[PDB]
Amino acid sequence: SMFMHNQALDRLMNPLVDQYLWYLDATSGNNLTFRKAGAKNFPEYFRNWIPGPGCRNQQWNKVGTKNNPQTGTWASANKWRLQGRLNKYAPGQPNAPAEGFLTNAGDLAFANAKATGATTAAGTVPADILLTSESETTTTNMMSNNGWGAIASNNQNASVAPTVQYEDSAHVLPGMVWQDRDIYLQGPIWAKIPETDGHFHPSPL
Amino acid sequence: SMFMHNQALDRLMNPLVDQYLWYLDATSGNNLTFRKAGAKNFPEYFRNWIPGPGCRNQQWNKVGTKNNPQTGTWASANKWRLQGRLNKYAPGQPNAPAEGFL
Amino acid sequence: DGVGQSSGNWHCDSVWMGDRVLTKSTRTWSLPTYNNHLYKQINGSGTGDAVYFGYSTPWGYFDFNRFHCHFSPRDWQRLVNNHWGIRPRRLNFKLFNIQVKEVTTTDGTKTIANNLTSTVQVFADTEHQLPYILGSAHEGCMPPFPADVFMLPQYGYLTLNGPGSNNNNLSTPSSAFYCLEYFPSQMLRTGNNFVFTYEFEKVPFHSMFMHNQALDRLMNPLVDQYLWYLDATSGNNLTFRKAGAKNFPEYFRNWIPGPGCRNQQWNKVGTKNNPQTGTWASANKWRLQGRLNKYAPGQPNAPAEGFLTNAGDLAFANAKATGATTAAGTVPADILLTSESETTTTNMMSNNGWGAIASNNQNASVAPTVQYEDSAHVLPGMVWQDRDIYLQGPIWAKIPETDGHFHPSPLMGGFGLKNPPPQILIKNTPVPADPPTQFSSQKINSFITQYSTGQMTVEIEWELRKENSKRWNPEIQYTANFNNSANAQFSVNNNGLYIEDRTIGTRYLTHTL
Amino acid sequence: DGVGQSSGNWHCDSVWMGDRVLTKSTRTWSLPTYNNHLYKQINGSGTGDAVYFGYSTPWGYFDFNRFHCHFSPRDWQRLVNNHWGIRPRRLNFKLFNIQVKEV
Amino acid sequence: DGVGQSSGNWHCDSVWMGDRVLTKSTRTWSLPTYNNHLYKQINGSGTGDAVYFGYSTPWGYFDFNRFHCHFSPRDWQRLVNNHWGIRPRRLNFKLFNIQVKEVTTTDGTKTIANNLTSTVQVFADTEHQLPYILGSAHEGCMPPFPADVFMLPQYGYLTLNGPGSNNNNLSTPSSAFYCLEYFPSQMLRTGNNFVFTYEFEKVPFH
DSSP states (O other), X not given: OOOOOSSOSTTOSOTTSOOSOEEEEEOTTTSOEEEESOTTOOTXXXXXXXXXXXXXXXXXXXXXXXXOOOSOSTTTSOEEEETTEEEEOOSOSSOOOOTTEEESSSSOEEEOSSOXXXXXXXXXXXXXXXXXXXXXXXXXXXXXXXXXXXXXXXXXXXXXXXXXXXXXXXXXXXXXXXXXXOOOSSSOOOOOOOOOSEEESOOOO | OOOOOSSOSTTOSOTTSOBSOEEEEEOTTTSEEEEESOTTOOTTSOOSOOOOOOOOOOOOBSSSSSSOOOSXXXXXXXXXXXXXXXXXXXXXXXXXXXXXXX | OTTTSOSOOOOOEEEEETTEEEEEEEEEEEEOOGGGGOOEEEEOOSSSXXXXXXXXXXXXXXXXXXXXGTOOHHHHHHHHHHOSEEEEEEEEEEEEEEEEEEEEEETTEEXXXXXXSOOEEEEEOSSOOSOXXXXXXXXXXXXXXXXXXXXXXXXXXXXXXXXXXXXXXXXXXXXXXXXXXXXXOEEEOSSOOEEEEEEOOOOOOEEOOEESSOSTTOSOTTSOOSOEEEEEOTTTSEEEEESOTTOOTTSOOSOBOOOOBOOOEEESSSSSSOOOSOSTTTSOEEEETTEEEEOOSOSSOOOOTTEEESSSSOXXXXXXXXXXXXEESSSOSSEEEOOOGGGTTTSOOTTSOSEEEEOOOOBTTBOOOEEEEOBOOOOSSEEEOOOOOBSSSBOEEEOOXXXXXXXXXXXXXXXXXXXXOOOEEEEEOOOBOOOOSSOOOSOOOXXXXXXXXXXXXXXXXEEEEOOOOOOSSOOOOOOOOOSOBSSOTTEEOTTOOEEOOSOOBSOOSEEOO | OXXXXXXXXXXXXXXXXXXXXXXXXXXXXXXXXXXXXXXXXXEOOSSSSOOOEEEEOSOOOOOOOSXXXXXXXXXXXXXXXXXXXXOOOOOOOOOOOOOOOOO | OTTTSOSOOOOOEEXXXXXXXXXXXXXXXXXXXXXXXXXXXXXXXXXXXXXXEEEEEEEEOOBOOSGGGTOOHHHHHHHHHHOSOOOOOEEXXXXXXXXXXXXXXXXXXXXXXXXXXXXXXEOOOSXXXXXXXTTSOOSOBOOSSTTOEEEOOEEEEEEOEEOOSSOSOEEOTTOOOOOGGGSOOEEEOSSOOEEEEEEOOOOOOO
């Protein structure tokens, strides 16, 4: 798909008419109060689809003065392990970072012919390094700068308050949509799907 | 599908005959003790299939006197966020609540 | 035809022709009369995790499901060393040489006679309208060894229960009651015989190969990648490193290891383990309708070397083990363990979590941290192996009809089927005793005690995948043990008891990843 | 034919096709010998509202008359909720697998 | 066919025609149930010249091998005085008039009845895939004299043994176990009968 989306998921609707669906807004007063979804309050609407999977990833500001001075990023990277040995998890699902931030091997990066050797350094992202950005996908895919959402922490009664906890990672659920990572001019065209008894959405990361 | 199921997952089996599969029930006594799955103990059986996905959701009793007096339920809702802004997660996967709750 | 002439012949053999293999097997079975020709509901007591409501039935059923019914240990060796895959195609079922016998007890002695005019009645359920109890790995299958004679198991099912006051065993308005005489069965005297055929729908081959490479190890070691990453933040400036020069963890990869979850690991040495009088408290569990169930077996996640799990992988036993339990300082000699360690190249191991993840946002004054993920689930671009099929394991299972299912393969291993082989159900037709002369409208209480016996056969056409591999050096293959033993392996002992010495998986030959 | 081969098979089911429904049922029956193979007259005593004269017979008779012989409680539910009327048309009767035993 | 009619007739004779002679013989045999329908391994004890490892089988076998099964002492005299050589050519084998009987013991007495629906199952091994115990000059052949009734011998074989510590009777990884039900035999009630034919390859005259 060469196209960037024209709408966000949460923004798919007709703004001019309210939904016919009802929810419980307010418990106060020893009685239940049902509110009707509509009148330009978007977070409350019912929706058929939910944003794609992902996980958090440590974010490194492009300005060098604001970053924390680590002599290596291996300790802080997202990792997966196989046969008792740990491997950097790169690149993840196409989860865009915050504006003005980047990640450790979260997205592809290239270099000029001017860069020879194993390293380059500059006060900001070097002029030889060619960054890529998935920010075109933020309309569907999850961003990397925070978790996927909240969830109910505990059961309630009259004497205990309801609480919620935050989900840092997500996985595939029914009725969920996402974009695959983009192909660049300098990127690889294909890959071989390893022959295995199962694979899910077999597109190269 | 217009039908309601006739059986639970965990309840799919023949109750009259025990399985031929063995598991480790008891470690005590400095030796390993393997038990044979069967004799009407259902939780122990091996099964081919497992129940569907979901997540917890805050439950509100239909009786109004037992509920906690919140002037809004937005703070306690299940939410997913997109482009830095949070959205109620509704409706979730078809996960039934407790009887007498919503 | 008639009483004098036989209705069939004995076929047990195997025929290897090209890419097809055709197995035939026959056994001799014995069918009693269950429940005195009655249907009975069965139910538990009180509240708890095990509570049930169901019906026991005066019927019995043939189960050939398990593998080694269809294969001898030589045919299995011959199969798993030479081939990369197998799937079923057709099957053919027959009953013949039915004979029904009646029992009479005078004083304390039994005298068995032979009733020529009695019948048995049998049917197969093609449309799967009854509850399907196969694929649940029960007992009562064809024995491994052709000279054993076995007794058919009783048929029964159980259904929805409901929340009574102190009792969850109370039936629910939707609890179903199936009468098996409301099926159009077939009644068979001694002369006539029963047959039907079946055809499997297309399924993928089961992979008989172990992988030749790990995921993280797929690459050319001699040339570095062209991709760049941020190695070092120090010095108030960003430093990009180029992936390569024999540092593997840093490489970019297209694929990631499969899903799973941690599972408590129990050392095979008994002295090192913690003395728990039961493992139920420590097991991985999933819960349904408010009651908890052990989660077994999980996804094929191998444990550490020298460790095992609680119902994480399949386990079997000899014919020497009778009763519900065995114990030894180490894993008992009767217990037959299975191991998924062949899958560690893709699937996740059970001894630790799936990986780490970013804990927090950073700034100059706060250090970056990470947290560990104990469980994982399905993500795009992720690969795994399914659990292996053994010689003693189940062949198939029925995919429950539902609005959705993901990668529908049985967690015990097998071939998931939308339309599995039909259940086969059989009963002794009730013959009443002498009625009274004065009419009475009540049911007939007393019958003539009798049982039946005969022979069966199962002929399955298997499809299998040729092996073309150009690897120079030789491969691991299944071979008999090299010690001189008191009893030859997979053979009878002095007392005449057949013994499987160990389980055999199908994965020996390798394949590139 | 012969002693060795069966004379019939078990049919119990129901078939709903259009505006016809076709029910099949089978049972197993047991017949004694009544009256020691004799006919006997039977009669009451005295005068009253119940007084009778008749004959008891060394015979026995199949009676399928009642409804639920022919319908299961699900087939009945399925019948009475969906339809405004029913009438019979044809019937077919069979006996098979006779076997006689002496005491 | 059926229980009422016989499946064969009695043929015992000899026919001398030119340079061919054709012998027919029939006997009446009795087959028990060996090993309670079980396979059992059998083995010796200790070290010595006689040590063995094998299997006893719940089967039985017809052996006609020996000569005088096929020749009467007059036919033999008539043969050896008039001729310079003999070799076999073809053979024809048949079983018929099978009848199976069941035994019941009440107190200490036996009562033998006749089970019409029971079967026996028989096969011939054409490809010689089982261990071949004939030609070893055992007992259990057809008797010399046609009016004798004999009992069929039990089938069994023995296989490689191996050097355990004090025991050479210990099985070896290559010791073979043959299950005879893994052969496609033929099941016979009382009415039906069994037959096959065979043809010798050319051998020199004796």
